[PDB]
Design a protein around this motif. Structure first.
Motif, short mmCIF file in Angstrom:
data_model
loop_
_atom_site.label_atom_id
_atom_site.label_comp_id
_atom_site.label_asym_id
_atom_site.label_seq_id
_atom_site.Cartn_x
_atom_site.Cartn_y
_atom_site.Cartn_z
N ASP A 57 0.84 -1.19 0.00
CA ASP A 57 0.00 0.00 0.00
C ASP A 57 0.89 1.25 0.00
N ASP A 59 -0.38 4.14 0.06
CA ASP A 59 -1.11 5.13 0.90
C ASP A 59 -1.45 4.51 2.26
N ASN A 61 -3.83 2.58 3.04
CA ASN A 61 -5.27 2.71 3.25
C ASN A 61 -5.85 1.34 3.60
N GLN A 63 -5.61 -1.18 1.96
CA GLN A 63 -6.15 -1.74 0.73
C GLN A 63 -5.14 -1.60 -0.41
N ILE A 64 -5.20 -2.55 -1.33
CA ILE A 64 -4.30 -2.54 -2.47
C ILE A 64 -5.04 -2.04 -3.71
N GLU A 65 -4.44 -1.06 -4.37
CA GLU A 65 -5.03 -0.48 -5.56
C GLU A 65 -4.53 -1.21 -6.81
N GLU A 68 -0.79 -0.14 -7.06
CA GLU A 68 0.10 -0.73 -6.07
C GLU A 68 0.30 -2.22 -6.36
CA CA Z 1 -4.58 1.64 -2.10
#
Ligand code: CA
Ligand code: CA
Ligand code: CA
Length: 176
Positions: A57, A59, A61, A63-65, A68
């Motif tokens: 991550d 950021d 957050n 969560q994985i975008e 990322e």
């Molecule tokens: Ca993310």
């Protein structure tokens, strides 16, 4: 980010992303991430799954975008990447343990992510590196991740699904 992928390549990781990204919102939570690993037969604790998904991550957050996760594939391996993702995707697919990932071990695996290939599709998928055998060993199975032969920007994504299932699955062995 020490990455050398093309616009088309960015469309690859996308598939490896869906592996978890169910609603495809652009963030693979720990409940979704661990949803795959566990689906493969793993059992990562939310505690780690966090430190894991938080290890990439950008950021944090939790969560994985799609950026990322894609940057992960090009920020995980090093030298013997394939091999690494091989032995992993090897001992991951082989549930029986015969040094040869049979159809099931394959399909069943592809079904553990969502991909439901017919016994014919799998039995055919093997031929790819199974030379019309029936199973794929650390040699053949690897011949896949290193196929790029009869793909044409199609199969590269088919096998990519394993790249993650492996890498991602390997990330849990590193996060440690
Ligand atoms: Ca993310
Ligand atoms: Ca998601
Ligand atoms: Ca086997």
């Amino acid at each position: 980010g020490s990455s050398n992928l093309t616009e088309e390549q960015i469309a690859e990781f996308k598939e490896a992303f869906a592996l978890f990204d169910k609603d495809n919102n652009g963030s693979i939570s720990s409940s979704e991430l661990a949803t795959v690993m566990r689906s493969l037969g793993l059992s990562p604790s939310e505690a780690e799954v966090n430190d894991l998904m938080n290890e990439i991550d950008v950021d944090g957050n939790h969560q994985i975008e799609f950026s990322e996760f894609l940057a992960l594939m090009s920020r995980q391996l090093k030298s013997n990447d394939s091999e690494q993702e091989l032995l992993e995707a090897f001992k991951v697919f082989d549930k029986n343990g015969d040094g040869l990932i049979s159809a099931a071990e394959l399909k069943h695996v592809l079904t553990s992510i969502g991909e439901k290939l017919t016994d014919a599709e799998v039995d055919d998928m093997l031929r790819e590196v199974s030379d019309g055998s029936g199973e794929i060993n650390i040699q053949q199975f690897a011949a896949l991740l290193s196929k790029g032969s009869s793909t044409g920007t199609r199969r590269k994504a088919l096998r990519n699904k394993i790249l993650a299932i492996a890498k991602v699955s390997r990330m849990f062995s590193v996060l440690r």
